[PDB]
């Protein structure tokens, strides 16, 4: 049970928390600022919407009558005049590096002393990792340097960030991915027995107000 100075608690324990919190918020806002900018082609969004239409047809086609579903699946999977067959086209490290650099800088600037003691014991083999700035080989492995504290905070504030904060493909290849999956679908009408299911009980008029 060592005795450490309160100056350590006031200038290495709390500043590390503040750093690892505000730099995470900054990284989030910077990721938002540099979100994305991609080339948008009208044909790309058109084929994407057509793929979504085919997906919802092969997924929710059991709600429209059978004949309309047959007409749609025929227009989509027709060898002739079918969209998928006839129409042929003519076609993180950067996120995690700042955390490692800040860890290296914190190790460099806050080396040479014990920072805090983790309440759960650790094996001696990790002594050269948690105690980079200390030359004592006899001191327990629970006593860690500043870099270990920073990394513990980095891994422990990820879930706290969620409290303060709110939290097309290759067309020539994409067409076949939906064609092969839609050719095997059949209509299973869900309204073929809805009348008897409704007659089983009365209407929930309670709460009309």
């Amino acid at each position: 049970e060592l005795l450490l100075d309160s100056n350590i608690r006031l200038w290495v324990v709390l500043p590390i928390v503040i750093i690892t919190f505000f730099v995470g918020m900054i990284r989030h806002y910077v990721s938002i600022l540099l979100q994305s900018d991609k080339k948008l082609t009208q044909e790309q969004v058109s084929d994407s919407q057509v793929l979504i239409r085919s997906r919802v047809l092969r997924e929710n086609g059991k709600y429209i009558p059978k004949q309309s579903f047959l007409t749609r699946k025929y227009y989509f999977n027709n060898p002739e005049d079918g969209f998928f067959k006839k129409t042929k086209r003519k076609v993180n490290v950067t996120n995690v590096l700042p955390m490692i650099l800040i860890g290296g800088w914190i190790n460099m600037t806050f080396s040479g002393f014990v920072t805090t003691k983790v309440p759960f014991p650790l094996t001696l083999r990790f002594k050269p990792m948690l105690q980079q700035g200390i030359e004592l080989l006899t001191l327990d492995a629970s006593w860690v340097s500043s870099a270990s504290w920073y990394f513990l905070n980095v891994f422990g504030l990820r879930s706290i960030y969620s409290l303060i904060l709110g939290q097309p493909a290759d067309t020539n290849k994409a067409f076949k991915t939906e064609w092969e999956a839609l050719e095997l679908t059949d209509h299973q009408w869900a309204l073929d027995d809805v009348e008897e299911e409704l007659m089983a009980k009365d209407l929930h008029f309670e709460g009309m107000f």
Partner: protein
């Protein structure tokens, strides 16, 4: 472990008293000093000498070359960076939503 060398050399950089020589030494007293890295040393001969010895370089106190201004400026350089990047992201999202 270092291989056995019989010559235990005396280096001037190891003298815990630079030039405050204690003439005709007669005893050296050591006290635990409350901390875990410093020892209170009192060498009494003709002259009396008192100092502190850190065999492990004071592993439990804050450094003396600690740059208070550096971290006290980096804290603001992070707080104000957050405060401006929040509004920058908000304005960028507003411009993106309103095209």
């Amino acid at each position: 472990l270092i291989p056995y060398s019989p010559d235990v050399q005396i280096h001037a950089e190891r003298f815990i008293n630079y030039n405050q020589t204690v003439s005709r030494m007669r005893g050296i007293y050591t006290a635990p000093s409350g901390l875990e890295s410093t020892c209170l040393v009192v060498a009494y001969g003709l002259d009396i000498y008192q100092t502190r010895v850190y065999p492990s370089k004071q592993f439990d106190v804050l450094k003396d070359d600690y740059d208070y201004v550096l971290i006290s400026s980096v804290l603001f350089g992070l707080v104000f960076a957050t405060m401006i990047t929040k509004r920058l992201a908000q304005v960028k999202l507003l411009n993106r939503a309103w095209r």
